Design a protein around this ligand. Structure first.
Ligand SMILES: [Zn+2]
Length: 644
């Protein structure tokens, strides 16, 4: 377009190019008014930079529209807050960076909305966010990461970030960890930051008084809070969050406490006056409407409309004879059910859970305690095989590790697929590194000590088909914020976290834009073990819509006599405790007699997954070949049908 020029008031990017994403158009004006009006005062289109809009899927176009609407007070007028509550894997970083880049450079009045943004992030994901900026918009913008270093070296970085003048601001995007942010937010007070993005912001429950104070100190007008689950189901745990996001129309913290919080709690009190019960609930409903107004949530099933078929398989693996004997012997000696009860407690039940989880992963992780003769492993060293060591890992000694071994071995000879290995535990990854060396698989491990540059490098090497690396292993805490391992076709989620959002995030590293193959996710669980109980509590949290909890293995006052007993049980007979607990009406004597509902997919309850107790009806030859004594049961499902 030549009707553009250098030195005319115009939208930063042509609002009429084929696939433009127009976030704003100027209001209609009458011909008469237009002619008299001064041309340097007319609103201008806001149009997403083509560099980014060329690359956004439909849902992503909708997301940026939603964000931009919210954050500029066009959705809820007088409020500048937004809760982004998409399922993991729909590219939250891309939508956000698009938001940022739009706000940094454009507004209806034809100048930037904001001058600087702060992204608050888990420590493990800080570097991922930084890389995500580089990946999407190249040399155009320079982000800055702050995460640890000297208390004074951090202060310097922050001071440099804030004291930046007008027009050309070399460092307009800051990414700090929550840890450093909460300890340093005084620097940010009155420092004119336009936007905050609190990532993984569901960790900001009412008791996190540090972060909210720090967040208040900063006082950025427009606020995007990201969360795994929707909030409204468990609203009472999220007053602060709701208020931070919506303070534009909720008023002061004290005003909000007075109108909403105090009445709501007053009515919920076990002796409220019926009139009081009614008043509070009414206020809760008002609050729910506000959250509804400002929250966006899309689920991962919409990816199936342009990605290859994904196949998810939860695999129940039988504990080794050895593992069982250790497990039994631990329970018998530790007596974790009879170690802490009426009053609170969580000291020695945390550690007994911790030990059993290690045990399920591999006895080797438990071996050190057997040498000590520490409480719960007396004479356990006698159970270990005739001749054993540290250096060589023996995958047969563990159910899950065996199946892992099998999958990798089958995958390597049957396909030319690459594999992502995920574990919640460093020491488990250390065993994977040993396995790989012994099996002669080449691999890369995403550390956490890894520099920003080296992090970008190894990912790009891995996604290249020319690369010789077979396995990419990472710890799930690092498996988010746009990390994309598209070169890999299959992913093994080795062990379950208490929070379902964490597993979900890490699993979503492979079935993403640009994937060219059918994907296979594997979740390994040890049959009749705490692991099934973990996957069960995950399900329970998701089922009750919201339910975010970082605490679980910590403060164990939310279980009780019988439910605890269950947590520390061993079922040696079941094919899957998870399945038993369904009381499935679709399976008869190990055969699946009726299929799941027609339109059910990977986003469904395990009760609507395919249940499989014989290696019959699997859609993954690698898994089938891997099914021996080690596998007792498989839940499986798929994104959609390949036919397309
Ligand atoms: Zn069934």
């Amino acid at each position: 377009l030549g009707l553009r020029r250098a030195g005319v008031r115009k939208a930063l990017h042509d609002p009429f190019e084929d696939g433009a994403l127009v976030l704003y158009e100027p209001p209609a004006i009458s011909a008469h008014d237009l002619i008299k009006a001064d041309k340097e005062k007319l609103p201008v289109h806001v149009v997403v930079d083509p560099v980014l809009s060329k690359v956004l899927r439909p849902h992503q176009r909708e997301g940026v529209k939603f964000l931009w609407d919210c954050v500029t007070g066009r959705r809820i007028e007088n409020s500048y807050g937004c809760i982004m509550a998409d399922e993991m894997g729909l590219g939250k970083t891309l939508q956000c960076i698009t938001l940022i880049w739009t706000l940094l450079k454009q507004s209806p009045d034809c100048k930037p909305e904001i001058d600087k943004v702060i992204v608050v992030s888990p420590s493990s994901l800080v570097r991922n966010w930084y890389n995500e900026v580089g990946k999407w918009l190249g040399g155009r913008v320079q982000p800055v990461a702050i995460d640890g270093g000297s208390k004074d070296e951090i202060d310097s970085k922050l001071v440099n970030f804030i004291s930046q003048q007008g027009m050309r601001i070399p460092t307009p995007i800051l990414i700090i960890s929550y840890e450093t942010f909460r300890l340093h937010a005084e620097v940010l007070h009155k420092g004119k930051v336009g936007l905050v993005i609190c990532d993984e912001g569901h960790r900001l429950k009412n008791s996190d008084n540090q972060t909210y104070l720090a967040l208040n100190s900063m006082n950025a007008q427009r606020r995007v809070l990201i969360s795994g689950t929707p909030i409204q189901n468990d609203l009472l745990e999220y007053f602060s969050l709701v208020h931070f996001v919506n303070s534009g129309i909720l008023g002061t913290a004290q005003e909000f406490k007075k109108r909403f919080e105090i009445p709501i709690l007053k009515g919920r009190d076990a002796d409220a006056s019926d009139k009081d019960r009614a008043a509070g609930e009414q206020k809760l409903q008002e609050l729910i409407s506000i959250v509804n107004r400002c929250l966006i949530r899309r689920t991962s099933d919409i990816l199936s409309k342009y990605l290859p078929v994904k196949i998810e398989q939860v695999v129940c693996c039988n504990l080794t004879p050895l593992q069982k004997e250790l497990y039994k012997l631990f329970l018998k000696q530790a007596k974790p059910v009879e170690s802490l009860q009426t009053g609170k407690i969580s000291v020695s039940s945390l550690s007994s859970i911790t030990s059993l989880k290690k045990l399920c992963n591999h006895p080797a992780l438990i071996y050190e305690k057997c040498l000590t003769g520490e409480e719960g492993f007396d004479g356990a060293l006698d159970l270990f095989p005739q001749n054993y060591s540290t250096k060589a890992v023996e995958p047969q000694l563990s159910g899950k590790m065996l199946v892992l071994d099998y999958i990798l071995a089958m995958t390597r000879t049957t396909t030319s697929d690459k594999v992502v290995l995920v574990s919640n535990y460093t020491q488990t990854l250390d065993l994977f590194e040993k396995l790989c060396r012994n099996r002669r698989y080449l691999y890369v491990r995403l550390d956490g000590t890894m520099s920003i540059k080296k992090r970008a490098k190894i990912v790009e090497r891995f996604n290249n088909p020319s690369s010789p690396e077979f396995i990419f292993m990472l710890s799930s805490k690092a498996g988010g914020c746009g990390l994309n391992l598209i070169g890999a076709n299959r992913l093994v989620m080795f062990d379950p976290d208490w929070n379902p959002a964490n597993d979900e995030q890490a699993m979503a590293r492979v079935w993403r834009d640009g994937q060219k193959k059918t994907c296979y996710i594997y979740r390994l669980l040890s049959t009749g073990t705490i692991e099934e109980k973990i996957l069960q509590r995950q399900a329970h949290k998701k089922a009750l819509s919201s339910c975010v909890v970082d605490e679980e293995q910590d403060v164990e006052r939310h279980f009780s006599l019988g439910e605890l007993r269950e947590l520390f049980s061993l079922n040696e007979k079941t094919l899957s405790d998870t399945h038993d607990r369904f009381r499935c009406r679709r399976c008869v004597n190990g055969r699946q007699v009726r299929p799941p509902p027609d339109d059910s997919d990977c986003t469904c309850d395990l009760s609507n997954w395919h249940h499989c107790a014989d290696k019959r009806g699997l859609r993954d030859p690698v898994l089938q070949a891997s099914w021996d004594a080690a596998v007792s049961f498989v839940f499986h499902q798929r994104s959609h049908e390949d036919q397309r």
